[PDB]
């Protein structure tokens, strides 16, 4: 049977400069639209009606301060379809209501699905194991938990992260002040995975480069390698002795080493995703009850835990009125928490 | 401080007094460790994807490599053939030496910049200040996300070391 | 009537060390939250 | 300090049950030929 399906399959899988595949029918439009929406929004679109903020190059913002901002809190979790009941097909209103945000987030989610399908698709054609796709589940868990589950637990998309450099910094600081997210052991594990991943990347790269075999005569050692050679290009035996004597332990199985390098950052990101699922419901690691009971009763008891809560209280009271304009917070000067003099 | 919550205290106060999040050396540092962790999983997944079959399904594939063996344990050509098609051919390494050099250099250079950010904000050359940078025709301040960061930074500043300042400027 | 699907199980010494380190470190991390 | 007193047995079983699992598997591996 060589029908139209099989002929289409032939054309989609041609060896061209940019492989396409069946997965490319999903991947390429959704990735292109999400990227084009971000560039369109950061260049031309305001956040004045949703946030009270300028947020585009048109308005005078720079690369650090432009964003595609979340919709107004009053939209709830509306899909904000262009043809939906809020914008009613009006492209200009849609932009002013925050429609580009769900546009980017949703085309982005389906784009990410498409990229992972592409990793599966290409791996099956070339004949390799699909561990690259498996490792990409960690970026997907992060994106889904932070940009979708988290606002879906909250009151509206408004509290999702906005797509911009400084807008994401605000998201970090909001999470410290309101959620005490540095205290959360699921974030801690994520930090370990990311910093441990960066560590493993540096140390393995440096170990290889400094246990190379002399396989050429030039002082530039890059040339003395051939993709199809059978031999290892560096000494696993010398690398093992070096670390065993510097650090006490060393890798001795090269297959374990590279599996571990997949495992560490991927597990870290997955752990951080779980904690953000908790924050969707405000299920925080905010306090240690034992510390608060002691400190309530003993005004000489002070730890770095209680010091950081005072900082969180400053963050909340000083940023909330501007950061949550729909709440209409009016905090007279006399209620604002402040230390002496400052 | 030499502690876990003490570390967090240090970071929060650092943000209030230097706006480290808006400093490009901290931003290069983030690229360093985010990039390093990305390339870590990247390298690990590609090498693991192209391990040469040396074992049965009831045993760990790790027994297919023997410490000190002369021959490589995975097919870098098959890995390059996969990753080259994932992006495009010339975005993929086929030289193991320059690949591993890139793995070394990217997080190391990024962390150098992170260290230099702390070291130069030590002398109070602080992150970008765009507070009230956008002004309308009459002269009203138009807030940006930078101004929202400033509100958060002010809350950190007015509360930190709440009993330690007698005069209005926290100059150190 | 011996079942033909049985298979021996292994855990080598390095895996034991790795596993014990993970469990002790996880306990060291989570214990404070258990005591609260 | 008024800690949760179940924290003690929670931590102890958290260490012991999985550690014991690993020790059983390891020891019966050494005893094979």
């Amino acid at each position: 049977e060589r029908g139209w399906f099989d002929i289409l399959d032939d054309w989609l899988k041609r060896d061209r400069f940019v492989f396409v595949g069946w997965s490319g029918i999903l991947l390429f439009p959704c990735a292109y639209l999400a990227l084009g929406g971000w560039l369109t929004g950061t260049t031309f679109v305001t956040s004045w009606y949703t946030h009270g903020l300028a947020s585009s190059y048109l308005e005078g913002c720079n690369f650090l301060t432009v964003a595609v901002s979340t919709p107004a809190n009053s939209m709830g979790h509306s899909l904000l379809l262009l043809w939906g009941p809020e914008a009613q097909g009006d492209f200009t209103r849609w932009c002013q209501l925050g429609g580009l945000w769900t546009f980017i987030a949703l085309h982005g989610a389906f784009g990410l699905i498409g990229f992972m399908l592409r990793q599966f698709e290409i791996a099956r054609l070339v004949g390799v194991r699909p561990y690259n796709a498996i490792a990409f589940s960690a970026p997907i868990a992060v994106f889904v938990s932070v940009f979708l589950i988290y606002p879906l637990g909250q009151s509206s998309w408004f509290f999702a992260p906005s797509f911009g450099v400084a807008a994401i910094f605000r998201f970090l600081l909001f999470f410290q002040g309101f959620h005490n997210w540095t205290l959360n052991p699921f974030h801690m594990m994520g930090v370990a995975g990311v910093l441990g991943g960066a560590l493993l990347c540096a140390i393995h790269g440096a170990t290889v480069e400094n246990t190379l075999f002399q396989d050429g005569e030039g002082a530039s050692t890059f040339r003395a390698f051939n993709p199809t050679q059978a031999e290892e290009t560096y000494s696993m035996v010398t690398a093992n002795r070096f670390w065993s004597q510097i650090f006490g332990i060393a890798f001795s199985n090269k297959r374990w080493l590279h599996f571990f390098m997949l495992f560490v950052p991927v597990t870290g990101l997955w752990m951080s995703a779980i904690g953000v699922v908790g924050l969707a419901l405000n299920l925080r690691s905010y306090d240690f009850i034992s510390q608060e009971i002691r400190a309530a009763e003993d005004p000489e008891f002070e730890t770095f835990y209680t010091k950081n809560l005072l900082l969180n209280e400053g963050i909340r009271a000083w940023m909330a009125p501007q950061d949550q304009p729909h709440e209409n917070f009016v905090f007279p000067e006399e209620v604002l928490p402040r230390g002496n003099a400052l | 401080p030499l502690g876990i919550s003490g570390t967090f205290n240090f970071m929060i106060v650092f943000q209030a007094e230097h706006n480290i999040l808006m400093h490009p050396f901290h931003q290069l540092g983030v690229a360093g460790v985010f990039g390093g962790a990305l390339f870590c999983a990247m390298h690990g997944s590609l090498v693991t994807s192209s391990l040469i079959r040396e074992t049965t399904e009831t045993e760990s594939a790790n027994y297919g490599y023997k410490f000190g063996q002369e021959e490589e344990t995975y097919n870098i050509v098959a890995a390059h053939g996969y990753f080259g098609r994932l992006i495009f051919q010339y975005a993929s390494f086929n030289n193991s030496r320059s690949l591993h050099f890139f793995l070394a250099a990217w997080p190391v250079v990024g962390v150098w910049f992170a260290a230099l950010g702390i070291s130069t904000m030590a002398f109070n050359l602080n992150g970008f200040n765009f507070n009230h940078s956008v002004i309308d025709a009459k002269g009203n301040v138009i807030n940006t996300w930078a101004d929202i960061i400033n509100r958060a930074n002010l809350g950190m500043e007015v509360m930190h070391e709440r009993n330690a300042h007698n005069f209005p400027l926290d100059l150190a | 009537e011996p079942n033909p699907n049985r298979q021996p199980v292994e855990l080598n010494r390095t895996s034991l060390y790795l596993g014990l380190l993970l469990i002790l470190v996880l306990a060291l991390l989570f214990s404070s939250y258990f005591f609260n | 300090m008024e800690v949760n007193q179940l924290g003690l047995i929670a931590t102890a079983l958290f260490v012991l049950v999985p550690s014991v699992f690993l020790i059983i598997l390891y020891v019966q591996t050494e005893s094979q030929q």
Binding site: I249 | - | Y17, S31 | -
Partner: peptide, 30 residues
Amino acid sequence: METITYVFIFACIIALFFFAIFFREPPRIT
């Protein structure tokens, strides 16, 4: 009770370091 628990766990880890370094499986070349 909680102090004893934290120090006990910490002490086990330092013990584990000792055995992992000095009573490791030796790497053997082939």
